[PDB]
Amino acid sequence: MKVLFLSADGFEDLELICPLHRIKEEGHEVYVASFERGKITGKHGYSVNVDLAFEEVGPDEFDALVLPGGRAPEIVRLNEKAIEITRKMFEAGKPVASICHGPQILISAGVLKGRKGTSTITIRDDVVNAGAEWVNEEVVVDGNWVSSRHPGDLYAWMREFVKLLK
Amino acid sequence: MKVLFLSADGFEDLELICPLHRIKEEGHEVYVASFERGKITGKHGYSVNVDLAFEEVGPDEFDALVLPGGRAPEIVRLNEKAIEITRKMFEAGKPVASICHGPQILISAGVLKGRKGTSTITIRDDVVNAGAEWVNEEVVVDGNWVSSRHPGDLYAWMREFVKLLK
Known part of the structure; x- marks a missing residue:
């Protein structure tokens, strides 16, 4: 499968690099993918090459989507193309994995009404206001949406996500 | 299986955390396991709990051994108990995984004569002097000893190693 990650500077390093x-x-x-090609640098100083800019991405091209956390989702969520990619893949029923602040992008895409999942507890209320049910579990699998909270959950996040990939 | 990691402060964060x-x-x-219970902190500032002090560990109680890199192996290799654990497990043919500077522990255990593997290139000459054949590959499998070089190799390192835990 072709698996797409959306991110930017200030990503939580483990949440991007261990799943990669x-x-x-x-x-x-x-x-x-990110704002431009080049490299981006995590909260903790690891760097990662960026293959594509958002504007080069066609949603039909990719089979699955991963949304890592950190401080990156706060700026990614403002990009109209990043939101659209996310909306289109999520609503088409493609595997979407989120962790930590990652669901801020899902909130802005407007796809969470009636869904169930988790996040870092510091944005629980925002997830609920977007129309979802929030629960405090290490991993939650709501159809195509696999969600976890924080770097301690990585093993469970990836266990359940990798099942969806074929 | 029970899988044992030996490390200390100054571990390369990804090399310990992604395999865990x-x-x-x-x-x-x-x-x-480390010098004492508590927390250790990596080069890039991630922390991990230590479950056991070296002195609590019985070699025979564990099934496999991981030796991450960073600056931790330089101090771990001085601990007589860590070296004893390593030697016994390695000589019993239990799966042992090393990366980067990890093999400094194997050097000091005295188990590398007539073996074959890789490391970071900056300690190639020390691995050779310890009696091993050094090669430059992303992953080398020499019987029970699975070795890689740096964090770019992680996917290949874990792929081959997890096969041995079957």
Whole structure:
């Protein structure tokens, strides 16, 4: 499968890099999109190459979407193209994984009404206001949406997400 | 299986943390041992709990061994108990995974004569002097010893290693 990550500077380093490797291990292709090509740098100083700018991405091209946390979602969520990619993939029933602040992008895409999931507890109220049910669990699987809270949950997040990939 | 990590302050964060989650994902128990119980902190500022002090560890109680890199192996290799644990597990043919500077622990255990593997290139000459054949590959499998070089190799390192925990 072709697996798309949306991110920017200030990502939570582990939430992007450990899944990047986990999904490569399976033999899938992984792409990182952001505002421009180049590299981006996490909260903790790791850097990651960016394959694509948002504007080059066609939603039909990719099979699955990963939304890592950190401070990156706060600025990604303002980008109209990033939102659209997310809306289109989410509503088409493609596997979407989120962790930590990642659901801020889902909130802005307007796709959470009637859905169930989790996030970092510091944005629980925002998730609920977007129309979702929020629960405090290490991983939640609501159809195509696999959600976790924080870096301690990584093993469970990836366990359930990798099942959806074919 | 019970899988044992030996580390200390100044570990390369990804090299300890991404495998810890990968291996939990599979349903194995994972234990981190260091000089004392508490927390250790990596080069990039992530913290991990230490479950056991070296002195609590019985070699025979664990099924497999992971040796992450960073600056931790330079101090771990001085601990007689860590070296004893390493030697016994490695000589019993239990799966041992090293990356980066990890093999400094193997050097000091005295187990590398006639073996074959890789490391960070900056300690190639020390691995060779310890009696091993050094090669430059993303992952090398020499019997029970699975070795890689740096964080770019992680996906390949874990792919081959998790095979041995079957």
